[PDB]
RNA sequence: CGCCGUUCCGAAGGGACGGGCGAUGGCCUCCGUUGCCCUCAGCCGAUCGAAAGGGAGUCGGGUUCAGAUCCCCGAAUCCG
RNA sequence: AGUUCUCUUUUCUUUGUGAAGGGCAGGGCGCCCUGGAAUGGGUUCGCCCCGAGAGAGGGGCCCGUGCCUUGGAAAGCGUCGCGGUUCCGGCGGCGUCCGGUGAGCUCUCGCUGGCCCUUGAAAAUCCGGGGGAGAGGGUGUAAAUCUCGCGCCGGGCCGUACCCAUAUCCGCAGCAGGUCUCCAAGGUGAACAGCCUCUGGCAUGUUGGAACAAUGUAGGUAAGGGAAGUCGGCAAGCCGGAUCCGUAACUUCGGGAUAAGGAUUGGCUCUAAGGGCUGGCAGCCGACUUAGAACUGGUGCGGACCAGGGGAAUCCGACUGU
């Protein structure tokens, strides 16, 4: 069948912390299907962003935490996650939220 | 793991001292005290081995 | 705890002198009707949905009524 | 102050460790003043009252290994402490062979593949220790058959 | 309630070493 | 122990209550000479012998 | 002062289904109670002796500064 | 939630359902009925079973602490978000999911055996049966009667805190002593051994600081020699695991025996054998083992820990035990 999951980082986007097409690039060249990086294992998980949400949809199975993991994986590469946190907002969002500082 | 300890004051494994374990809703193991094991009936007949049926043990 | 299978012995056992509320719960599946008595609470179980409303419309005048959320 | 009252407390409402209370180094004079449950069910509800995750031990390390164990590394003769029917006993081994050899023959009779005469002669022959596994007893039943065909078309 | 406060005030209070004898005695001073 | 009967509970109470201080309007007495309670016991000290 | 002894040199049962007599009662109809008599009765050893032996029947959730299978909420059960 | 310089679809945490009732798995039967078995068959790890009735069919019963169900999601927990007096059993959203595997350990239920010149409580208490003295009513507003299902009332007295032990107990004490028990994680490993670690706990054991003489106490190492020391090899030291091989005198034939004496042991990459489920074949699942081979490192490899020195004799006492 077919599982969606989405990534909302409307509040980082919304304040120029983080771009969501260079988010969108990192996902491509990075989630592994069969241990392979590069062509999505064959077009099965598309990748389709919106204005400040990013959407992954895959035929196979694919588990919605490894979103979780490149996102926190991306998020430190920026030097972000001293400020954003990844939360689930339903059963197939995630959001990127601020830590309740001052 | 969770460790057991007694519900009551007697610490020794006698014969009336037998216990089970029980997952409760609370979400944790206890020690529930088992009832002894009882005998169905012997024949009076003295010679047949068995217990007799039809008869709660 | 007794569970009832039919509604005719349901509506008997709240006409009961000891039976002092009936607790009307929804589920997503089913609506129990449960009933405490001197003894049992007995439950039941309502697999449709309209039955339960002409049920709940029918009980003795006079059982506390409570439903639960 | 001395919150030894506030770790405690807060240990039994949190089901935790006094090991694993951390209480807000910056807010002891608000903790100070919590003597009771209710409180301290507030100051963990606010924050000032936290439970620290367990200290991590990660099987990582041993699972990494026993991987490697099952393609047969480090377990040479270097490598054992306990006698060859210490590691293995006999006694399991021959419980397995003799379930697994029994159920062939069930099986075979069953499907008529031998006969009761057959199976009978077979049966104390595995008990005999004449077949060390399943393909060589399902071999020598192959071989029984041809000679007994054999003879069949001889009558 | 968000673990990584732990770390937050941990660090935070790690940082009166430079202004000892004048700590806030309550940092939420709202109320 | 836990497992006590009512005549040593009771003996015992008796015991926990002469365990006190004088009351200090004592001292005021017209030819009063306590000065302290001298009958004074520790559970760790000296021990009741049942 | 006492000791031995525990069924041994003992008239060691105060009980009962039922039956017969009276006396009392009350939902005075008839049923109860009570006293006497007839009948039936081995136990054969008073009593003590175990917070590990035998021995009916309670569990879940919450709750305290300190008590909880004991308090509260709920759901059960044994005995009489 | 942690790490993310690089790598890691990664590592960690957590992922409920009580008693009682019903239903159903599963286990057990020295229970029944048909029938008549040698070309004897059935069967276990072992056994053991049968004309006094086996195999094969079809049934009955006991325990079901296992799963479902009423309990019961309302509760609990995980998590995110809002509230309040804010010391509220506060209120919401989502979740509380699916499989596998084992001579694994702990408890328990059961079947079958072995040991005894050892045979491994009693009573309270409760139950069934045999018997048939009696009782009940004359066709009914039926009666005596009921261990059935509901309903009604009550359960008095005493104990209950905490310590339970390198500081709550006994040793004159917060004494390295003594003092009965229950539960029992990961790795290595034969292992409840030792070594490291998680949960939980602690603050080094009635003080601290600075030095690092002698003499000590407890640990180590020593060239060449190797008991020359000493009453005496005291003390220390050698050996030590496991696999393969090999093994004497004597013997009460059971032993002696790990006799004695050798070889091997790492890491890495492979090979072969050892199974279940479904429908001599095909597909899918698997759990640890054993054996062999190549390559490889400064010959190091039971790398720490754990872990027998051996032989030839004499005296005494058979041995185990005290
Ligand atoms: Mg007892
Ligand atoms: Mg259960
Ligand atoms: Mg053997
Ligand atoms: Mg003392
Ligand atoms: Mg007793
Ligand atoms: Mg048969
Ligand atoms: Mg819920
Ligand atoms: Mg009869
Ligand atoms: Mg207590
Ligand atoms: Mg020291
Ligand atoms: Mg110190
Ligand atoms: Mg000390
Ligand atoms: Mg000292
Ligand atoms: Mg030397
Ligand atoms: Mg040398
Ligand atoms: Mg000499
Ligand atoms: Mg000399
Ligand atoms: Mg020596
Ligand atoms: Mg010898
Ligand atoms: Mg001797
Ligand atoms: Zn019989």
Same mark, same amino acid.
């Given at each position: 069948?077919?599982?969606?999951?989405?990534?909302?980082?409307?509040?980082?986007?919304?304040?120029?912390?983080?771009?969501?097409?260079?988010?969108?690039?990192?996902?491509?060249?990075?989630?592994?299907?069969?241990?392979?990086?590069?062509?999505?294992?064959?077009?099965?998980?598309?990748?389709?962003?919106?204005?400040?949400?990013?959407?992954?949809?895959?035929?196979?199975?694919?588990?919605?935490?490894?979103?979780?993991?490149?996102?926190?994986?991306?998020?430190?590469?920026?030097?972000?996650?001293?400020?954003?946190?990844?939360?689930?907002?339903?059963?197939?969002?995630?959001?990127?939220?601020?830590?309740?500082?001052? | 793991?969770? *460790?057991?300890?007694?519900? %009551?004051?007697?610490?020794?494994?006698?014969?009336?001292?037998?216990?089970?374990?029980? %997952?409760?809703?609370?979400?944790?193991?206890?020690?529930?005290?088992?009832?002894?094991?009882?005998?169905?009936?012997?024949?009076?007949?003295?010679?047949?081995?068995?217990?007799?049926?039809?008869? *709660?043990? | 705890?007794?569970?009832?299978?039919?509604?005719?012995?349901?509506?008997?056992?709240?006409?009961?002198?000891?039976?002092?509320?009936?607790?009307?719960?929804?589920?997503?599946?089913?609506?129990?009707?449960?009933?405490?008595?001197?003894?049992?609470?007995?439950?039941?179980?309502?697999?449709?949905?309209?039955?339960?409303?002409?049920?709940?419309?029918?009980?003795?005048?006079?059982?506390?009524?409570?439903?639960?959320? | 102050?001395?919150?030894?009252?506030?770790?405690?407390?807060?240990?039994?409402?949190?089901?935790?460790?006094?090991?694993?209370?951390?209480?807000?180094?910056?807010?002891?004079?608000?903790?100070?003043?919590?003597?009771?449950?209710?409180?301290?069910?507030?100051?963990?509800?606010?924050?000032?009252?936290?439970?620290?995750?367990?200290?991590?031990?990660?099987?990582?390390?041993?699972?990494?290994?026993?991987?490697?164990?099952?393609?047969?590394?480090?377990?040479?003769?270097?490598?054992?402490?306990?006698?060859?029917?210490?590691?293995?006993?006999?006694?399991?081994?021959?419980?397995?062979?003799?379930?697994?050899?029994?159920?062939?023959?069930?099986?075979?009779?069953?499907?008529?593949?031998?006969?009761?005469?057959?199976?009978?002669?077979?049966?104390?022959?595995?008990?005999?220790?004449?077949?060390?596994?399943?393909?060589?007893?399902?071999?020598?039943?192959?071989?029984?058959?041809?000679?007994?065909?054999?003879?069949?078309?001889?009558? | 309630?968000?673990?990584?406060?732990?770390?937050?005030?941990?660090?935070?209070?790690?940082? @009166?070493?430079?202004?000892?004898? @004048?700590?806030?005695?309550?940092?939420? @001073?709202?109320? | 122990?836990?497992?006590?009967?009512?005549?040593?509970?009771?003996?015992?109470?008796?015991?926990?209550?002469?365990?006190?201080?004088?009351?200090?309007?004592?001292?005021?007495?017209?030819?009063?000479?306590?000065?302290?309670?001298?009958?004074?016991?520790?559970?760790?000290?000296?021990?009741?012998?049942?």
């Amino acid at each position: 069948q077919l599982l969606k999951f989405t990534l909302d980082c409307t509040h980082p986007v919304e304040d120029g912390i983080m771009d969501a097409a260079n988010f969108e690039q990192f996902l491509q060249e990075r989630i592994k299907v069969n241990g392979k990086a590069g062509n999505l294992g064959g077009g099965v998980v598309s990748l389709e962003r919106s204005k400040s949400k990013i959407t992954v949809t895959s035929e196979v199975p694919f588990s919605k935490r490894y979103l979780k993991y490149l996102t926190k994986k991306y998020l430190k590469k920026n030097n972000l996650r001293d400020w954003l946190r990844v939360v689930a907002n339903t059963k197939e969002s995630y959001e990127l939220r601020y830590f309740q500082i001052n | 793991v969770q *460790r057991l300890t007694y519900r %009551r004051r007697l610490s020794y494994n006698t014969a009336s001292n037998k216990t089970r374990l029980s %997952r409760t809703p609370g979400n944790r193991i206890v020690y529930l005290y088992t009832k002894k094991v009882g005998k169905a009936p012997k024949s009076a007949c003295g010679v047949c081995p068995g217990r007799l049926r039809g008869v *709660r043990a | 705890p007794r569970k009832i299978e039919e509604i005719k012995d349901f509506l008997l056992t709240a006409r009961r002198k000891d039976a002092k509320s009936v607790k009307i719960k929804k589920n997503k599946d089913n609506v129990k009707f449960k009933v405490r008595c001197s003894r049992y609470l007995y439950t039941l179980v309502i697999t449709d949905k309209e039955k339960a409303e002409k049920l709940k419309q029918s009980l003795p005048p006079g059982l506390a009524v409570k439903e639960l959320k | 102050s001395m919150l030894r009252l506030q770790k405690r407390l807060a240990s039994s409402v949190l089901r935790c460790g006094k090991k694993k209370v951390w209480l807000d180094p910056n807010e002891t004079n608000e903790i100070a003043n919590a003597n009771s449950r209710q409180q301290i069910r507030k100051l963990i509800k606010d924050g000032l009252i936290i439970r620290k995750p367990v200290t991590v031990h990660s099987r990582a390390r041993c699972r990494k290994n026993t991987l490697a164990r099952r393609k047969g590394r480090h377990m040479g003769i270097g490598k054992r402490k306990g006698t060859a029917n210490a590691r293995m006993p006999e006694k399991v081994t021959w419980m397995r062979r003799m379930r697994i050899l029994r159920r062939l023959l069930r099986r075979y009779r069953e499907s008529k593949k031998i006969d009761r005469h057959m199976y009978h002669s077979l049966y104390l022959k595995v008990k005999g220790n004449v077949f060390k596994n399943k393909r060589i007893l399902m071999e020598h039943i192959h071989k029984l058959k041809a000679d007994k065909a054999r003879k069949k078309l001889l009558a | 309630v968000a673990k990584q406060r732990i770390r937050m005030a941990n660090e935070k209070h790690s940082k @009166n070493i430079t202004q000892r004898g @004048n700590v806030a005695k309550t940092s939420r @001073n709202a109320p | 122990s836990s497992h006590k009967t009512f005549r040593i509970k009771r003996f015992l109470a008796k015991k926990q209550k002469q365990n006190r201080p004088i009351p200090q309007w004592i001292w005021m007495k017209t030819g009063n000479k306590i000065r302290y309670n001298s009958k004074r016991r520790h559970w760790r000290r000296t021990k009741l012998g049942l």
